Every structure is written in structure tokens, then in C-alpha cells.
């Protein structure tokens, strides 16, 4: 537990996408509760949130 901050990634247990209901989402770091609707806003290739 020294030298560089090494990341060992982790397990990848992904589930199906939720269309329209209040669910608990874990979007690879973001935790909360809400409805995951479709979007019209356009992101950038380096922007994640």
C-alpha cells in the first residue's frame, strides 16, 4: 500500500437498463435514486457527468 496509487479496477456486474421508474442507480461512481429518461443534450467525448 505504497508507491503509486495503484488501481486494481474491480468486478463488472452490470444489469439491464431501466426505462422509466424510480430505481437506485450505480453509474460507475454515482449513487442516487431517480428516473433514467432519454436525453437531448449533447455531451463532449471527454466529459462523463
Amino acid at each position: 500500500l505504497l508507491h503509486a496509487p495503484a488501481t486494481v479496477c474491480g468486478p463488472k456486474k452490470s444489469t439491464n437498463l431501466v426505462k422509466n421508474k424510480c430505481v437506485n442507480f450505480n453509474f460507475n461512481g454515482l449513487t442516487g435514486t431517480g428516473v433514467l429518461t432519454e436525453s437531448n443534450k449533447k455531451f463532449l467525448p471527454f466529459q462523463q457527468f
Binding site: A4, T7, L44, F46
Partner: peptide
Amino acid sequence: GFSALEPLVDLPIRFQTLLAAYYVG
């Protein structure tokens, strides 16, 4: 002119150059 600099690559871990008219900031 104004131009924002997008991230290229983040690499997890005396200045010289080779081939001019280059600047250094």
C-alpha cells in the same frame, strides 16, 4: 483568438525538442 484546450490523454504513474520557431511558456 480564444480556443479552449480539450484533454488529450492522462497518463497514470530540462526540456528539449527535436525536429522550428517554437515557444515556451
